[PDB]
Amino acid sequence: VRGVRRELILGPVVQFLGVPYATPPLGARRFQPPEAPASWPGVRNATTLPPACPQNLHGALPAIMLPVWFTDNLEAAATYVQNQSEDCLYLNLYVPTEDGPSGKKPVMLFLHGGSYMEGTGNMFDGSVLAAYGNVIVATLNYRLGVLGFLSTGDQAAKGNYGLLDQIQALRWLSENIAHFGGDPERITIFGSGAGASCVNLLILSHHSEGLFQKAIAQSGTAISSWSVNYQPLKYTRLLAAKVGCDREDSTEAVECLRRKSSRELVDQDVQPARYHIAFGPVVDGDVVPDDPEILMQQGEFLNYDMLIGVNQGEGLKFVEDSAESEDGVSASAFDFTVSNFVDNLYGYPEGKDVLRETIKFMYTDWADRDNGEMRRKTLLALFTDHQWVAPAVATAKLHADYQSPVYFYTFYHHCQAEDAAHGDELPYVFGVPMVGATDLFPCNFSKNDVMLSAVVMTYWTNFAKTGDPNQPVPQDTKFPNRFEEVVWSKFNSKEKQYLHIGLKPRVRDNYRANKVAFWLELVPHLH
């Protein structure tokens, strides 16, 4: 098959928009594993954007857990997902002519979105990256929301469909990609928010055997509160209830849902618990053999070259609760929001009272007891720490305790339209400073902001090529270069050596370890 060509300093690139990786889940192929692609009779029109999977933007919207650009520029994010259909199992590719400023080039597949219910790979134009990196960038669509992960916990509706869509799409590359100047033995998955979570889940599976070698979890992982749903029935019941499908039997209630139109099914509204998710991956016993954390602990996976990191103040949204106030963030509201923190997370709650006040303590800066800002600040941190930072470390810790080589980072950069927040790392990874402000990235891209985009891409790309970011292409940005005299040491369990991304780059040791430990070592051992 063949498609179309584009260009902007750099070496030009070919796109492949609307290539399928499996027969679309339409009839009673819905809530069924994807079977492989229906056979292509003619030169397929691989020329324009494939439509999006079933999602609703207009209400049911996990604010806190979504990237910033998403929920700052919804009107702009809407434009991509407007052409919806159930037939959405199509990936895209971006492959270049020449090396940017035919031996088999590596493959960087993008998992995406932010919640399990929101996004498409189309939003991410991974074209610049391909050109500048000289590798094959793949952006897909997996099944979302209900269609992705509805489950009974029975043979009737096993769930984890969305992953299996990612797995198949990956299997497409493995078998095919070779015929785009691609390499089947240096395939590299990379994610953000939920994608990250997904990245980490595929790793632990068996079903991703000969499909990839390298993995990049940009801000997020599989052991967090909202990466994995450990109560599938309860929420499917509430869904089945709002469409009159909740029968006492399992198998019959599943076969009911088939017949309700896809349009009607997803845009339904079920809220989950606080800091949880209702529709998402589950411990099935096939693509997720056991509880992710337990799998990670016992070493029930194989050695994928990992690259995890995390941003300064991820869940900025968490403190968008009383952001516009600026007497600060209220004294006694601090207590409150923490009380709900402990309850919907650890709230078992026989000995909770301690847990609340002792976790309050660690984050209240006792220098200035009275300043609201230097609670707000800290509350951001609190949430940040628990819902990304710590988990991420502990995953690394395990994956390097079993000797997968693995490198760690921290990201420290906004670019202002309106604290480095969750998501803000993306445009730099996808090179969007090099093209100019797109609709969902409005920023004054500084001379510096570019340098940063180059350096991240150079690192990230190299990593796909070798499993060593700082090797292959060495650090340069003279086309000073502030990343020249710095080597990204390998992470390990002992000296938790990581790379500080930013204008001031360097290696440091034990990110935030003090707080890390509080959450990893003391707190769960209270009860």
Binding site: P33, E35, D154, Q155, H206, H207, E209, G285, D286, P289, D290, L295, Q298, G299, E300, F301, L302, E521, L522, H525
Partner: protein, 184 residues
């Protein structure tokens, strides 16, 4: 379809599983393992955690370090290769170890042991002890895990000899071991 489905052999102990096939394959250290992986199609069986092309996996004198998750990737390429996988929870209970320490009059007895599963610690003095002016606890640095018996103030007649009875609840035919230390 090209199928697979695992059944145990070798030396299991007190069997339990879930909706798909055997979640757990418990085995003791020093025994022999045998996991037979069935087929429909024929396919070619594949055990892995170099892909070993044995139908039946087998390990003589199984060690703690051999435990983990193994899968069976049977395939003739008739649809997706079926992949059924299983836990190898190797079990044991070592010789437990016992240090001490002294001052005005408090005496500590520290008791470690490496086990799998995590052992249960019991403390004696002729008959078993639990909370008057006498404490027991687990710590943060659980390199065992460990258990500690503290005597607060040596009263005339808590000067007798003690035992750190460790147990794995007798599971998979494994005896309870213990350890003694005297006092004066």
């Amino acid at each position: 379809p090209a199928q697979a489905q695992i059944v145990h052999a070798g030396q299991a102990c007190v069997v339990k599983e879930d909706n798909i096939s055997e979640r757990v394959y418990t085995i003791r250290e020093g025994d022999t393992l045998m996991l037979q992986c069935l087929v429909t199609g024929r396919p070619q069986v594949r055990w892995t955690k170099e892909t070993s092309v044995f139908e039946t996996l087998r390990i003589e004198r199984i060690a703690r370090t051999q435990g983990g998750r193994y899968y069976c990737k049977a395939e003739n390429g008739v649809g997706v290769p079926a992949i059924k996988s299983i836990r190898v929870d190797v079990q044991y209970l070592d010789e437990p170890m016992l240090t001490v320490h002294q001052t005005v009059k408090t005496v500590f007895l520290r008791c470690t042991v490496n086990s799998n599963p995590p052992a249960r610690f019991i403390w004696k003095r002729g008959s078993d002890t639990l909370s008057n002016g006498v404490d027991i606890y687990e710590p943060l640095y659980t390199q065992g895990e460990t258990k500690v018996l503290k005597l607060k103030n040596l009263r005339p007649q808590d000067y007798a000899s003690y035992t750190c009875q460790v147990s794995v609840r007798n599971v998979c035919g494994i005896p309870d071991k213990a350890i003694t230390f005297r006092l004066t």
